[PDB]
Amino acid sequence: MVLSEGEWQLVLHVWAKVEADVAGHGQDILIRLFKSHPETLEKFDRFKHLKTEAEMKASEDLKKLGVTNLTALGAILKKKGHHEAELKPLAQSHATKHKIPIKYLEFISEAIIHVLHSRHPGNFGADAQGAMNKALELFRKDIAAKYKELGYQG
Numbered sequence: 001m002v003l004s005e006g007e008w009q010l011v012l013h014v015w016a017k018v019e020a021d022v023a024g025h026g027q028d029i030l031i032r033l034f035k036s037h038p039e040t041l042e043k044f045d046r047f048k049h050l051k052t053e054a055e056m057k058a059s060e061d062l063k064k065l066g067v068t069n070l071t072a073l074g075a076i077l078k079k080k081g082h083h084e085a086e087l088k089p090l091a092q093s094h095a096t097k098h099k100i101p102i103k104y105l106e107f108i109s110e111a112i113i114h115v116l117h118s119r120h121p122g123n124f125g126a127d128a129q130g131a132m133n134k135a136l137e138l139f140r141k142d143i144a145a146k147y148k149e150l151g152y153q154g
């Protein structure tokens with residue numbers, strides 16, 4: 001799979017809006033992930049204790065984590081597919097240290113799409129969402145291949 005420049009444009013156009021407030025989008029996305037797929041929260045030893053959305057929103061550390069997560073993703077998206085260098089450290093830590101299965105990357109991809117659909121309807125119409133889904137599917141495909149190379153693929 002490979003995206004067209006036109007599709008990359010749709011992806012980077014909405015991401016530019018996301019960047020107006022990375023911290024806020026990071027919070028919304030992680031909170032959506034944890035509420036839609038509670039099992040995912042268990043992978044965060046530093047935040048596994050959070051019981052409610054209120055506690056999640058009030059967590060300064062969770063906010064920092066969200067910023068780090070979206071900034072890393074933004075760098076990857078901006079490479080428009082030429083993200084081999086960026087995927088190496090990310091794949092290693094998530095496969096070997098955090099033990100994050102591909103299914104969970106699909107879950108966070110779903111959360112990203114949900115939040116963008118909610119916050120940016122004008123710039124996240126059907127075609128734009130399709131482009132973003134295509135970009136995230138490419139990300140997960142390449143990450144999965146790396147996982148396999150690293151001996152995890154899960």
Ligand code: HEM
Nearest residue numbers: 040043044046068069072073089090093098100104105108
């Ligand atoms: C869009 C996909 C994701 C990106 C770009 C991403 C990015 C990052 C980055 C940059 C870090 C810090 C450096 C590192 O350890 O590699 C990190 C840490 C971490 N990630 Fe992810 N991540 C993603 C998805 C996930 C998912 C789905 C989970 C689990 C449900 C997860 C769990 C973790 C954990 C447990 C840490 C450690 C947090 C801490 O205690 O400091 N990540 N991630």
